[PDB]
């Protein structure tokens with residue numbers, strides 16, 4: 463019957479009530495978020511006199527331990543910011559309340575998935591996509607800081623939030639799936655639509671998997687639709703191949719899961735296994751983006767900053783983000799120097 467003296471539910475989530483007042487400080491307004499970790503609530507902090515977002519972790523050793531790993535990375539990041547110029551969500555403090563670890567974040571506005579939805583999945587402009595792209599690239603540069611070397615490991619539109627609904631400043635949230643660069647412990651990582659080829663191929667990975675995810679995200683922000691909407695891993699890889707061609711032989715020769723997707727011919731060349739799909743490399747990004755045809759579905763014809771020349775810069779940057787080879791794939795520092803950002 464009763465769990466944690468009536469405070470927790472079946473899933474070990476704290477049962478939130480509007481109007482409750484924790485620690486004579488936080489006035490709970492409403493539930494704004496939910497996930498495997500627990501819940502997120504909007505609350506007014508009476509001491510600092512501002513709204514905050516409190517992430518209430520479930521009352522279970524597994525989720526507690528995961529969330530203390532998130533706390534450690536956040537404090538490590540926020541210790542190399544202070545001025546907050548690098549677009550990571552800011553952890554203010556944490557405390558235990560009725561056996562739930564609570565992380566107090568600055569309160570943010572809508573996420574980029576909500577934006578897509580608000581466009582009816584037709585996308586936002588190239589100008590706004592540039593602004594998100596610039597900030598995300600600066601965030602990834604920050605994460606690559608040697609003493610950090612953090613992989614967010616689950617970048618996707620819903621994990622990118624606007625600071626303010628009338629402005630274009632963004633913050634990355636949810637470092638619960640994140641770890642630093644080390645020996646490979648985990649293999650089933652990233653969200654499928656944004657999952658890198660190295661990961662699909664069971665290969666070793668580094669910070670470059672975040673850059674792959676970013677390429678995918680940026681095209682989606684402009685088209686309204688995911689670049690690669692795989693219903694499973696095989697379909698995911700096939701959708702990547704349609705656009706980018708068969709992965710290079712030197713990669714696939716080292717891939718433990720090569721044969722999940724491809725097959726080695728007697729001459730050492732690799733083709734797709736049949737299971738539907740356009741031939742490899744024939745769903746070109748140039749055409750997906752509508753470089754010469756007025757953008758996605760022609761919806762940006764005549765709009766300023768949407769000329770052929772503007773689109774070719776965007777296209778060229780994304781292809782450098784979607785490089786098959788993680789060692790050749792563009793890095794944050796050089797991405798910021800791309801002509802797309804002039």
Ligand SMILES: CC(=O)Nc1nc2ccc(Cl)cc2s1
Pocket residue numbers: 494495502515517551567568569570571572623635636
């Ligand atoms: C949901 C909303 O309108 N604002 C939000 N703001 C935040 C800030 C931190 C975290 Cl982890 C989640 C959220 S959700």
